[PDB]
Amino acid sequence: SFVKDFKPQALGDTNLFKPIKIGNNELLHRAVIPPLTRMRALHPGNIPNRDWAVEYYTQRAQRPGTMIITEGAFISPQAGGYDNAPGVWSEEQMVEWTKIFNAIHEKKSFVWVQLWVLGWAAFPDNLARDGLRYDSASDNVFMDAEQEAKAKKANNPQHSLTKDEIKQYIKEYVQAAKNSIAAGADGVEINSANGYLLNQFLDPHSNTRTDEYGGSIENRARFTLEVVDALVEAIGHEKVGLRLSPYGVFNSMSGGAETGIVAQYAYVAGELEKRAKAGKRLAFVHLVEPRVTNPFLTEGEGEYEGGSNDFVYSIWKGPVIRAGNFALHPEVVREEVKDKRTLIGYGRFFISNPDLVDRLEKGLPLNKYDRDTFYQMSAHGYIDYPTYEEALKLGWDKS
């Protein structure tokens, strides 16, 4: 069915439909598909789903000139911990990623791969099974109750990375970025948000280190900035993006409670613009809005009003993708895009609406999303969401 009490608004007369050049890509519009994990990858090997992946992506790349950021992809076995999320380290995986990159490209859209590293958000037991450690910034602070239960049951205690294991992670980031570009991706996005590894190093709650990687604004951002620099040297700055979520609290992150949280992020944004001047400006900065502090809360829940992402604009002068509960709020989007260098990421509604872009331009109703198939080893709730036309033929009230 269609979203019940939603009053759509045509957005065709806005900047959301003015082209823009991101990296090497020329988008025909500014609605991007943010990284969305769907757990359809195949175990063993974290192989992208051979039966449905191409269809799903092909479906969402139908409106020409769309920028698509893929589901988080593990850069190595030690970076993972979820049996059904895809990896981007082996041939067996790249052979399937290529097919996917081709379908999107044939539809004249673009694709950026999100390099993912779990940290304490991984399942300690899955990692122990395969002989991998349970990594994180520190070892005297854990994610949550059941994470420490799982960890000790599996006897795979949270481990504080040594300076050498951090370098090894940097090695793997480069190799995975290279494999992705080599396989034909338009670029890669470094996920330094949502409480995953890098975010665990940025956060003063999860990072209680005393070495060169903790203890100050400058040290907490170190790991993240070294990944940036390394990838920039390896494949070029116009092929790299950085995702941040300043006020997010998902996965045990601080958010607005940390008085020094804004300074932590303003510093990162500044160093980025520093390099921008030195010629090496990243493709973009992706920000998770405080409108959604937790992606697993219904729209309107976990909304932070004591803080704003606007400070980034004062520091970073490049393109900025903002994601978070924008689909059901065209009036909000309408104002946000008045700014000339802003893109909007639509998450949850790009799951249930393969033709979102067209429904946004024309102000047509929105298909509801089934929360239950977000993470299911099924085609149902993955590739069977109908386009507006099909929804009509089905009689989602308008026959």
Ligand SMILES: Cc1cc2nc3c(=O)[nH]c(=O)nc-3n(C[C@H](O)[C@H](O)[C@H](O)COP(=O)(O)O)c2cc1C
């Ligand atoms: C099913 C699902 C999977 C997601 N997977 C990822 C992911 O792989 N990496 C990431 O950085 N964010 C992920 N997100 C967060 C989204 O990118 C987005 O920022 C968030 O859903 C807020 O946007 P929305 O209100 O338009 O859905 C996910 C969200 C959902 C609901």
